[model samples]
Target: MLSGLNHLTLAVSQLAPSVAFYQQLLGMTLHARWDSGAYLSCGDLWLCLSLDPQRRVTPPEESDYTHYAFSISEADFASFAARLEAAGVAVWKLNRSEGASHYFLDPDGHKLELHVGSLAQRLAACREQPYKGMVFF
Candidate 1:
């Protein structure tokens, strides 16, 4: 029923910082804006930032693992991490999966990640270390 990820909207407490963070830091291009929201795009991913009275300041607890991950090339991984570290973005998690990844939080406390691998690679890795009774399509 769905062709692809058409867009993702996040309700933010502060509009300007969220806009600036996604635009300047994440390198998404701003496509549109209004008093309460802004539209931005990185690659084919359309991201919407909405200013809402009910937006959350943080995740429920430390156990929350919901996050959005962006793909980065292996060649660009180190430099990307360096740039983010220079910007004072704290690392939220360590990489323990199929790819070189760095998980971090955004200005709005949204969990985000930069991963240096593809689905094909992950599948191959899983095949090498298959889980109990795992099946593939």
Candidate 2:
């Protein structure tokens, strides 16, 4: 019945603060708020941060954690990595193969990724050019 990702609903310790964080850091805008939660959107993705004042919410599996990422130009990936490092947020190399670059984590510890350009472009850079026999080749 479902076609694609409709929304991701997760429990936040606090709604207003998380809303502000998403707004300022991720360029998401608040779409709505409720007694139980808030909704924020980035492009087509909807992230719902819910609050339960009367109870505690269990965290989901680390392996199942949600990561929202976007594609950018190759030059923008360098700028993004530098900016994340300058901000002192933890960034880890998940995959550096075939000219595909990505980073990890936001200030709230949510994983973020920036895949520069298309897979075909990345393949061309590594396969048709300078990356012969490289580890990421």
Candidate 3:
């Protein structure tokens, strides 16, 4: 049985730009930084952004649809979307059976989501649908 996610670490090509993308655009608070990487507080989760030029960072395939999502309150959704757009992040819309979600790729080509509800709420809504499993990919 797991408690929750401790942190999410991402391998990135560029450190400074990734740091700025998360801190300046997404409002994650920077906690620490090292020569190769940095750590930030992203709500309940810790986000580790690492830079290693020797390794290749995987770009999300259009058909893959895998992403890491962050939840925000319904009241904050609009403002968050506005901020993301103002930061020049490309935002995308998805047609979900549950709550609303928008996709955006980080500076390192990592796909991220801004969802407007809790996991439980989204799951409940999904259960009401005719589908058998999670709609989120």
lDDT of 1 by residue, 1-137 (tens): 97888889888999998999989988889998889999998888999999998877784255378889988888998898789999998667875654678888887678889887888888888898876797989
TM-score of 3: 0.83
Number of clashes in model 1? 0
Candidate 2 or 1, higher lDDT: 1
Query: Per the 3 Å backbone cut-off, how many clashing residue pairs does candidate 2 have?
Result: 0
Residue by residue across 25-116, what tens digits does model 3's lDDT show?
88899999999999999877999998978645445564266678888888998888877888788644456545687787887667789888
- Superposed on all Cα atoms, model 3 deviates from the true structure by an RMSD in Å of 3.3
Best by TM-score: 1
The lDDT per prediction is: 0.84, 0.65, 0.79
State how far residue 131 of model 2 sits from its true place (Å).
15
lDDT (tens digit, per residue) of candidate 2 on 26-127: 568888888778888877888887775643433223434456666667667787767657766566455565355666654345556777777667666766
User: In candidate 2, how many Å is residue 17 off?
Assistant: 3.4
Error of 2 at 7 (Å): 1.4
Give the winner by TM-score: 1 or 3: 1
Count of backbone clashes, every candidate in sequence = 0, 0, 0
Deviation (Å) of 49 in candidate 3: 0.5
Report lDDT (Cα) of residue 72, candidate 3.
Answer: 84
Candidate order by decreasing lDDT: 1, 3, 2
